[PDB]
Amino acid sequence: ASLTEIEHLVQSVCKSYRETCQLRLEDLLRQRSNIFSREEVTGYQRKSMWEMWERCAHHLTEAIQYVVEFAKRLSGFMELCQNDQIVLLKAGAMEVVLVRMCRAYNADNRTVFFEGKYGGMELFRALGCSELISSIFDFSHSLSALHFSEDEIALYTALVLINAHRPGLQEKRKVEQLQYNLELAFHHHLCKTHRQSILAKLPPGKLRSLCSQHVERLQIFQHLHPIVVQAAFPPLYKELFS
Amino acid sequence: KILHRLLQD
Ligand SMILES: CC(C)=CCC[C@@](C)(O)[C@H]1CC[C@]2(C)[C@@H]1[C@H](O)C[C@@H]1[C@@]3(C)CC[C@H](O)C(C)(C)[C@@H]3[C@@H](O)C[C@]12C
Numbered sequence: 001a002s003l004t005e006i007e008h009l010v011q012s013v014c015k016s017y018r019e020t021c022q023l024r025l026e027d028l029l030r031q032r033s034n035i036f037s038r039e040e041v042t043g044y045q046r047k048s049m050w051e052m053w054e055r056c057a058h059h060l061t062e063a064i065q066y067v068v069e070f071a072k073r074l075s076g077f078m079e080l081c082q083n084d085q086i087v088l089l090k091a092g093a094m095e096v097v098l099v100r101m102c103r104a105y106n107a108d109n110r111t112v113f114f115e116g117k118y119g120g121m122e123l124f125r126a127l128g129c130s131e132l133i134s135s136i137f138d139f140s141h142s143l144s145a146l147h148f149s150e151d152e153i154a155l156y157t158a159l160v161l162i163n164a165h166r167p168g169l170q171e172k173r174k175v176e177q178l179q180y181n182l183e184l185a186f187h188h189h190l191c192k193t194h195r196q197s198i199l200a201k202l203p204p205g206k207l208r209s210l211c212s213q214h215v216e217r218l219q220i221f222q223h224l225h226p227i228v229v230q231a232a233f234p235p236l237y238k239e240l241f242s
Numbered sequence: 243k244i245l246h247r248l249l250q251d
Binding site: 065068072082085086089090235236239240 | 243244
């Protein structure tokens with residue numbers, strides 16, 4: 001390796017990220033004054049639990065679809081065997097979304113951009129999972145305090161996804177090599193932009209714990225509403241989480 | 243399976 005080759009990886013990951021975002025950062029910034037009214041909030045709160053679940057799982061699934069496209073443009077990803085591509089996406093895609101959502105989060109009033117306006121965590125009360133919701137919102141507040149650039153999110157999310165410790169990987173060496181090259185590229189970029197102080201502040205088990213809390217909450221919902229899950233949750237969502 | 247298709251297409 002050499003610096004040019006590492007810096008090429010950085011630019012390639014940032015571009016892949018840019019083309020697979022879904023919502024552009026400037027779009028999200030320009031809507032920050034567009035906040036749900038007390039009555040719109042109340043409207044969300046009065047929705048049935050099963051309806052709120054279906055809507056949320058829909059938007060999450062759409063988000064995950066963009067993560068898949070990001071993966072497919074990640075240098076090295078498509079050269080892994082398909083078994084390993086799937087392992088990495090099953091364990092990683094939700095973690096990616098949870099990192100990517102800090103872009104849509106306004107830490108000044110603790111709201112998130114959801115179905116066209118910003119709203120507070122109380123918007124999601126009808127879900128019945130205040131503890132998970134609260135921890136997601138805190139997680140995003142933590143990440144917002146770092147002031148991630150778009151390049152930092154790109155590189156960090158690549159590393160969330162390319163993790164050679166995922167159980168089930170058939171060629172764990174090949175993934176380790178990819179991961180180490182991505183780690184070098186991220187750290188290189190931080191060293192060049194005088195941002196190495198963030199290394200210390202990145203989250204620890206934390207991403208894992210949020211994804212676990214998601215899955216245990218789903219098993220409770222599907223036990224109480226199994227036909228709703230069968231008939232009205234997206235196929236992709238069930239494939240990743242059920 | 244959906245994943246298979248998204249990865250192939
Ligand atoms: C109820 C349950 C266990 C699962 C379904 C709901 C939850 C708990 O897992 C809850 C957890 C928090 C939750 C509301 C989520 C929804 O499904 C998906 C959304 C979005 C990804 C949808 C799209 C938007 O573009 C953005 C701003 C990125 C949203 C995120 O800001 C918030 C998020 C992740």
